[PDB]
Design a protein around this ligand. Structure first.
Ligand code: OX8
Ligand code: OX8
Ligand code: FE
Length: 274
């Protein structure tokens, strides 16, 4: 059995195997952490299949939702990984031992070392973390050399007609921009977004939450269109000065090592280019 260490946000159901061989991930937040720890994923989520970075490493995995109990059963998992919002752990636990993670209890870096502790891969985890911290601190200097040290960044995501602001730990590049590069945010973003993590926003207050730079995540090119054509949007200094970094949500939603590596290089190149 796994030693099953007690970790904030981690709940074990059943007897976690010490070396899982057939993992079903039902939480795209964590799939790429498992991948990075060279675990064999035999089921993954829609989001994971849509992630152009991660998808390449899980081609053999079946796409499964939590609602596909029969499909999951057929995969013969020895471990199922879920987010704590999953409402039917009860039936999942009847199929295989389940690990449930409550989002945000541990940070984007701790999550990896935590899995290291659970699954006997603290070596592989600690190597990645050390190199990550090195590379990021270097890149931070490079990017701040261009923008200045006090440049403000806002993280933004578009979905359908919805507009969200994000903080430092709700994906969309906020972990890299706000944590790894230690960029400040506009005042209203800090006081209204950072603690909660995200904020649904009226389009017409947007200028008040954007300073020097803005990172905007979206799943396709069309979703922006009409906002990007608006006078209000076009009146925003950061937009006028081409300080808008448009990124692909299908990878930028996540904070796993694989997604992050790509995000890190993408964001660095974008800022240097400005
Ligand atoms: O649990 C839900 C909604 C359940 C649902 O029906 N989904 O579709 C969510 C799928 C998320 C896709 C991966 N994105 C990230 O990990 C980035 C952060 C984020 O945005 N989250 O949602 C983190 C999950 C926990 C936050 C609370 N919200
Ligand atoms: O909206 C949902 C489910 C989808 C979700 O959460 N995803 O991450 C999926 C991809 C983005 C979908 C567009 N929706 C947003 O961007 C909303 C901000 C967000 O994502 N939260 O997690 C805030 C927490 C609570 C929100 C209520 N639950
Ligand atoms: Fe979300």
């Amino acid at each position: 059995l796994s030693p099953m260490p007690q970790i904030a946000g981690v709940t074990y159901y059943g007897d976690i195997p010490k070396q899982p061989k057939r993992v079903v991930s039902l939480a795209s937040t964590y799939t790429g952490y498992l991948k990075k720890l060279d675990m064999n994923l035999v089921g993954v989520t829609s989001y994971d299949k849509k992630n152009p970075i991660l998808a390449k490493t899980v081609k053999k995995a079946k796409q499964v939702a939590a609602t596909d109990l029969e499909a999951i059963t057929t995969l013969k998992p020895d471990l199922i990984v879920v987010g704590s919002t999953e409402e039917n752990i009860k039936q999942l636990a009847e199929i295989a031992p389940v690990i449930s993670i409550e989002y945000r209890k541990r940070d984007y870096l701790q999550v990896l070392s935590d899995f290291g502790r659970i699954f006997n891969k603290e070596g592989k985890a600690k190597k990645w973390l050390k190199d990550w911290k090195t590379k990021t601190a270097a890149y931070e200097k490079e990017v701040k050399a261009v923008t200045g040290d006090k440049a403000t960044f806002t993280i933004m995501g578009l979905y359908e007609k919805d507009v969200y602001l994000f903080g430092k730990d709700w994906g969309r590049g906020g972990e890299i921009i706000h944590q790894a590069f230690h960029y400040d945010a506009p005042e209203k973003v800090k006081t209204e977004v950072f603690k909660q993590g995200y904020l649904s926003l009226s389009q017409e207050v947007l200028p008040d939450y954007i300073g020097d730079y803005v990172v905007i995540a979206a799943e396709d090119d069309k979703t922006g269109s009409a906002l990007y054509e608006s006078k209000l949007w076009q009146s925003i200094p950061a937009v006028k000065k081409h300080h808008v970094i448009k990124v692909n949500a299908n990878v930028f939603y996540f904070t796993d090592p694989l997604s992050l590596e790509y995000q890190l290089e993408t964001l660095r190149e974008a800022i240097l280019s400005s």
